[PDB]
Amino acid sequence: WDKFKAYNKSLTGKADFKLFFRWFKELIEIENSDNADITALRAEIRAKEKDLDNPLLKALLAENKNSETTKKLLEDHQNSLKVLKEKLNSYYSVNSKTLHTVEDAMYSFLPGFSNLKLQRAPLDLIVDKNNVSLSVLQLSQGEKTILALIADIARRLTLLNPNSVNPLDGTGIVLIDEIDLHLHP
Amino acid sequence: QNLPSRITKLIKKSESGDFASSYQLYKVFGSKEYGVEPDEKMSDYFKELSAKQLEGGQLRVADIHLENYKGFESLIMDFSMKKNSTILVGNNGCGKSTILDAIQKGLTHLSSRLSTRSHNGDGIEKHELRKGQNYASIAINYDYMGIRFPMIIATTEPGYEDRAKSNYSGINELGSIFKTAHSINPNVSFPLIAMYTVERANDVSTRDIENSEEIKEAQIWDKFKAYNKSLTGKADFKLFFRWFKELIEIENSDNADITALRAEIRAKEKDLDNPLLKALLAENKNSETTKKLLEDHQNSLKVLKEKLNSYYSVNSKTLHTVEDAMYSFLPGFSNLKLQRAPLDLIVDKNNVSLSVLQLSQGEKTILALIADIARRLTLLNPNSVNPLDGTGIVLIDEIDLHLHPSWQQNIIPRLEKTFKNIQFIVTTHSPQVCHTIDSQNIWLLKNGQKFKAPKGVRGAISSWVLENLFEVAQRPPEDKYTKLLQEYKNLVFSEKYASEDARKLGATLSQHFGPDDETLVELKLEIEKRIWED
RNA sequence: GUUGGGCGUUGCGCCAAACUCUAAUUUAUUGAUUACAU
Ligand SMILES: Nc1ncnc2c1ncn2[C@@H]1O[C@H](COP(=O)(O)OP(=O)(O)O)[C@@H](O)[C@H]1O
């Protein structure tokens, strides 16, 4: 992880789901096989980041908030995420932080989708909506190519950008030819 | 309505409890051909009962009939049913391998019609015909819960009209019974069919493990899949390596979502306690929104506890059972793990970490054999208290390969102790395997004929079993010192007890064999006795 | 391991006896046989 071992061989570009499934499989398994201390931190980041978007408490916060106690509480659980992500960043580790960013790439480019697991008895890399779905089988043909491209961009930007609590906030050139390739209208 | 008498007899048999009695009862009430009006509900009941009564039965080979096969003109053998181990002993060139090769080409057919729809298999080739004859025939009777299935496979040279047509009446029956049992219940235990040829000597190699992560995903995980390349010998290790990777990955991928869930429960407990948050909520307790949010948080915490309990009762013993059953068979070895740098396995012996690919040749063949049996039993037998208690036929050919004569006295009983419901028809040439099985089971073979073992072949002096089962003398038959021993012994028991040669052979045989052994002390004592008498 | 006898807390439990060429009987609306209703 010296920022230059993946910077090269990128001027050609590859974006396919066959080489993304095998990559994500190793990334989610190797990270969890050894280490195993960053897994709990990342899972609790997921819990804290998805529990804030509670419609009940969100409506209560959006309601009359003249008392400063609720503002202090919201600042406190924002600082919770701040320090938590700071701790993960302090754990300088390749193959353990790129997973979180690549998951965030698919958590935003595909709006409203929840946690992403990887079953094994059937492979079936599942994406969680309010109802369960499957990516290896469903999700069309081009909705896998574009996701592979997004994942590659996220991984490459994360590797090129150490620290940077939001690694997918770099700057540079990314040229795509015929962006309308395998897309539903 | 005057139910036929045969139908009443079948109903009585089913009431007593049989599996075929209800099979031929749900196919008599589901069609108009058999002569009774078709009733669907009362046929479904019989089908369910037939499938339910199949559990607890062992599938064994009862008898076999070779006629003009490789080297046997006419052979009839009957394998014991109360005993779970049959041993074939004979010279190199009598035909013990022929009987195993005849048990296959029928076991292949049984596996094909129990797993696939092909309805094909092996057969007698032209080169296997007895030199001079024209027709050959192999007949095997399969047993299940005291009810037998016929079979016969035959051939004729394409110059004369065939005088022995093939027939597979009973194996189609057995396959249909098992398939129906699977249809009504997806987790019905099935028998295991496999043979391990001498070609398992080179089973484990670095080449096989190098590309074991580059095979198809749907070739290892389903009940009906532990049958491909299973009677070809060459106990599979690549598929075993893939299977071991997947199980260790299930352990290393789950049990962390369990840890994550426990951490989430702790965090939620902190969030609910949260003295600041509790104090803030205490300001407005009667508010409907606050009560709603608190009750929903409590319900979510209870649901999270239920989710944790869901994986709290997994206990994936699929790995533990295999590891424990394979550690006991190979003494000392323990803590088998995986190392991902050159995608290789690591096993620990005598507090030394070594790779499987570099182990002794006498410890990888047994390793792969036990691993293949355990994996196939686990695949064929779904979720159960003990998945290694399955039935079937395992044909271990030339068990004496790569074994020190210290494990041969503990190989058969250990296989029977770990696997206590599998038939183990085997062949051997080491006389330290024979003296652990009853005399009624060993089937001597010479000159194309079957001879029963002499009385008392169980635990005894190895010289006696050697002499009375292999026709090989205890001492060398042509050795100079052995000839001197004989020429000393006969003269001791005859003229020239103390003469020209008595002393010189005495000294020569005292320099070797030591001056203190069994035979020479006997001879010296008796010569002293009968020189004192004179 | 297989066969014939006896008693009755009898769709078979027990008792009392025997035999070992290397080695156990299954089909109906069919035809032959025993038996009731004719
Ligand atoms: N066409 C044939 N004609 C005569 N003998 C044959 C023929 N085919 C096979 N055989 C006999 O089969 C024997 C092979 O023995 P085998 O089955 O390998 O048992 P084992 O491995 O225990 O010695 C040989 O003794 C050979 O004579």
DSSP codes of every residue in B276-305? HHHHHHHHSSS-HHHHHHHHHHHHHHHHHH
Distance CA B325, CA B371 (A): 9
Coil, strand or helix: which one is B17?
Answer: coil
Distance CA B50, CA B78 (A): 28
Q: What is the dihedral of CA A129, A132, A135, A141, to 10 degrees?
A: -80
Distance of CA B5 to the CA centre of its chain: 43
Which among B380, B410, B411, B409 has a CA at the least distance from the CA of B393?
B380
Q: What is the dihedral of CA B14, B16, B18, B21, to 10 degrees?
A: -30
Distance CA B377, CA B190 (A): 9
Distance CA B23, CA B174 (A): 11
What are the backbone angles phi and psi of residue B449, rounded to the nearest 5°?
Answer: -150, 155
Distance CA B522, CA B534 (A): 19
Which tokens belong to B36? 């009774």
Which among B167, B138, B173, B146 has a CA at the least distance from the CA of B64?
B138
Distance CA B185, CA B206 (A): 40
Which among B261, B245, B267, B382 has a CA at the least distance from the CA of B311?
B261
Q: Which residues precede chain breaks (C–N over 2.5 Å) in chain B?
A: none
Residue length of chain B: 534
**Quick check: B17 CB within 7 A of strand C?**
no
Distance of CA B31 to the CA centre of its chain: 40
Burial class (CB in 10 A: 0-12, 13-18, 19+), B324: middle
Residue length of chain A: 185
**Quick check: B12 CB within 7 A of strand C?**
yes
Q: B466 CA distance to ligand 1 centroid (A)?
A: 24
Distance of CA B224 to the CA centre of its chain: 17
Which among B423, B422, B436, B426 has a CA at the least distance from the CA of B401?
B426
Distance CA B86, CA B424 (A): 6
Q: B400 CA distance to ligand 1 centroid (A)?
A: 20
What are the backbone angles phi and psi of residue B118, rounded to the nearest 5°?
Answer: -65, -35
Which tokens belong to B488? 């000393």
Q: Output the CA torsion sign for B88, B93, B95, B97.
A: positive
* Closest in A29, A60, A76 to B252, CB measured: A29
CB B323 within 8 A of CB B330: no
Per the entry, the structure determination technique was cryo-EM
Which among A164, A100, A158, A106 has a CA at the least distance from the CA of A135?
A106
Listed in order, strand segments (DSSP E) in B344-407 are 344-349, 352-355, 392-396
* Closest in A48, A118, A120 to B246, CB measured: A120
- Cα–Cα separations (whole angstroms), residue B30 to B9, B261, B406: 18, 52, 59
* Closest in B250, B277, B293 to A56, CB measured: B293
* Ligand 1, atom 9: closest residue by C-alpha: B70
Which residue of chain A is at minimal alpha-carbon distance from B277? A73
Taking the C1' atom of every nucleotide in all shown strands and the CA of B9, the nearest one is: C26
Distance CA B140, CA B63 (A): 6
Q: B469 CA distance to ligand 1 centroid (A)?
A: 21
Looking at residue A80, its amino acid is S
DSSP state of A54: -
Which among A71, A82, A92 has a CA at the least distance from the CA of A48?
A82
Kind plus residue range of the DSSP H or E element containing B525: helix B519-532
Which among B31, B27, B196, B21 has a CA at the least distance from the CA of B104?
B196
Residues of B within 8 A of A59 (CB-CB) are 289
Name the residue with tokens 């019974």.
B177
Q: Is B198 in the pocket of ligand 1 (CB under 6 A)?
A: no
> How far B267 CA lies from chain A's nearest CA (Å)?
8
**Quick check: B447 CB within 7 A of strand C?**
no
CB B29 within 8 A of CB B43: yes
Distance CA A161, CA A166 (A): 9
Provide CB contacts within 8 A for B32, sequence distance 6+.
Answer: B38
CA(B150)–C1'(C30) in Å? 26
Taking the C1' atom of every nucleotide in all shown strands and the CA of B63, the nearest one is: C23
**Quick check: B263 CB within 7 A of strand C?**
no
CB A41 within 8 A of CB A87: yes
Kind plus residue range of the DSSP H or E element containing A133: strand A132-134
Name the residue with tokens 């049989």.
B18
What are the backbone angles phi and psi of residue B42, rounded to the nearest 5°?
Answer: -75, -10
Distance CA B60, CA B106 (A): 13
Q: Mapped to the 3 state alphabet, what secondary structure does B477-523 carry?
A: CCCHHHHHHHHHHHHHCCCCCCCHHHHHHHHHHHHCCCCCCCHHHHH
**DSSP strand pairing (B135-144 vs B59-67):** antiparallel
Q: Is the minimum CB–CB distance between A89 and chain B shorter than 8 Å?
A: no
Coil, strand or helix: which one is B267?
Answer: helix
CA(B146)–C1'(C5) in Å? 29
Nominal resolution in Å?
3.5
Which among B140, B143, B134 has a CA at the least distance from the CA of B122?
B140
Provide CB contacts within 8 A for B58, sequence distance 6+.
Answer: B144, B145, B391, B421, B423
Chain C: nucleotides under 7 Å from a protein CB?
11, 22-24, 27-29
CB B355 within 8 A of CB B346: yes
Distance CA B31, CA B43 (A): 10
**DSSP strand pairing (B135-144 vs B152-156):** antiparallel
Distance CA B327, CA B321 (A): 10
- Cα–Cα separations (whole angstroms), residue B123 to B69, B134, B153, B164: 12, 15, 7, 13
Taking the C1' atom of every nucleotide in all shown strands and the CA of B451, the nearest one is: C22
- CB–CB of B253 and A28 under 8 A? yes
Helix axes B238-253, B361-380, angle to 10 degrees: 60
Distance CA A86, CA A68 (A): 26
CA(B425)–C1'(C14) in Å? 39
Name the residue with tokens 């006629």.
B67
Sheet containing B344-349: give its strands across: B334-339, B344-349, B352-355
CB B72 within 8 A of CB B447: no
CB B61 within 8 A of CB B79: yes
Q: B93 CA distance to ligand 1 centroid (A)?
A: 6
Burial class (CB in 10 A: 0-12, 13-18, 19+), B364: buried
CA(B79)–C1'(C6) in Å? 37
Which residue of chain A is at minimal alpha-carbon distance from B266? A44
In degrees, rounded to 5, the angle at the alpha carbon of residue A53 between the alpha carbons of residues A51 and A56 is: 100
CA(B31)–C1'(C25) in Å? 30
Half-sphere exposure of residue A131: CA atoms within 13 angstroms, side-chain side? 0
Distance CA B81, CA B423 (A): 9
B:471-530 Cβ neighbours of strand C under 7 Å: none
Distance CA A60, CA B296 (A): 14
What are the backbone angles phi and psi of residue B495, rounded to the nearest 5°?
Answer: -60, 165
A-B C-beta contacts closer than 8 Å: 53
Q: Please identify among residues 105-164 of chain A the ones whose CB lies closer than 8 Å to any CB of chain B.
A: 117-118, 120-121, 123
Name the residue with tokens 């869930």.
B261
Q: Is the minimum CB–CB distance between A62 and chain B shorter than 8 Å?
A: no
Q: Is B68 in the pocket of ligand 1 (CB under 6 A)?
A: no
DSSP state of B311: H
